[PDB]
């Protein structure tokens, strides 16, 4: 169909040198959740559909994914979803106000299997710090991966940052929350583990 063309003018948000005003954007004062790299937006649409009392922003640079998400959001009659097609880090720096977000989601970011590409992995200290600055206190950074070396790297990064508190009761990974759906990479309750690792850290006041 012609989803980008049809639905971008209503739900799309253009990149700007200026901070977003969430009340003006969403027409109300409500909690805001950002999904970074939403793919086809299946998780984001399901999330927004279940929480009409909350607002949702998505970022995805893969424009066919953006189109798929718009088509689905339109079909579900969502009024509480906006999407961007711009580098997420630039959007975080330029357009997301500090302390503004209830939740940030990062599901299956490029795992960059090869050791020579390890630095291409988006979860690193400066990125996670930037995300933390955009969370309100008590807000959560939730990431997921189906690649264990990435999961271990994510845990190392997150554990090193003052102001992030691990919500894992075993100091590593958390049960999949309702806020993320089961995927095809996933064998829930499998004897060798689910095959997907969830990490959730709450923003707390700095200790040191």
**Would the annotation count 162 as a binding residue?**
no
Within 13 Å of residue 21, how many CA atoms lie on the same side as its CB? Answer: 3
Residues designated catalytic: 110
**Would the annotation count 18 as a binding residue?**
no
**Would the annotation count 35 as a binding residue?**
yes
> In the numeric block, which tokens belong to residue 181?
């759906």
Residue 202, strand partner residues: 140, 165
CA distance 59 to 143: 15
**Would the annotation count 60 as a binding residue?**
yes
> CA angle, 61 as apex, 9 and 51 as ends, to 5°?
65
**Would the annotation count 202 as a binding residue?**
no
CA distance 139 to 204: 8
Q: What are phi and psi of 86, to 5 degrees?
A: -155, 155
Alpha helices in 40-124 (DSSP H): 42-50, 63-75, 88-95
3-state class (DSSP) for residue 132: helix
**Would the annotation count 183 as a binding residue?**
yes
**Would the annotation count 14 as a binding residue?**
no
**Would the annotation count 185 as a binding residue?**
yes
Identify the DSSP state of 124: S
**Would the annotation count 114 as a binding residue?**
yes
**Chain centroid to CA 153: how far?**
18
Identify the DSSP state of 118: G
**Would the annotation count 90 as a binding residue?**
no
Which residues belong to the annotated binding site for substrate?
114, 146, 183-186
Which residues belong to the annotated binding site?
35, 60, 87, 110, 114, 146, 183-186
Which residues belong to the annotated binding site for S-adenosyl-L-methionine?
35, 60, 87, 110
């Amino acid at each position: 169909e012609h989803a980008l063309e049809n639905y971008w003018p209503v739900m799309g948000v253009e990149f700007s040198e200026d901070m977003l005003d969430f009340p003006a954007l969403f027409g109300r004062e409500a909690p805001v959740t950002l999904e970074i790299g939403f793919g086809m937006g299946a998780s984001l649409v399901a999330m927004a559909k279940d929480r009409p009392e909350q607002d949702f922003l998505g970022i995805e640079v893969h424009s066919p994914g953006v189109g798929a998400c718009l088509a689905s959001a339109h079909e579900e009659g969502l009024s509480n979803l906006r999407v961007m097609c711009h580098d997420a880090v630039e959007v975080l720096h330029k357009m997301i106000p500090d302390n503004s977000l209830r939740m940030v989601q990062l599901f299956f970011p490029d795992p960059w299997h090869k050791a020579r590409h390890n630095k291409r992995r988006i979860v690193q200290v400066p990125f996670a710090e930037l995300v933390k600055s955009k969370l309100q206190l008590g807000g959560v950074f939730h990431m997921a991966t189906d690649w264990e070396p990435y999961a271990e790297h994510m845990l190392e990064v997150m554990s090193s940052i003052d102001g992030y508190k691990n919500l894992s009761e075993s100091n590593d990974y958390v049960p999949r929350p309702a806020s993320r759906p089961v995927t095809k990479f996933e064998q829930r309750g499998h004897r060798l583990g689910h095959g997907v690792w969830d990490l959730m850290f709450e923003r707390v006041k700095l200790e040191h």
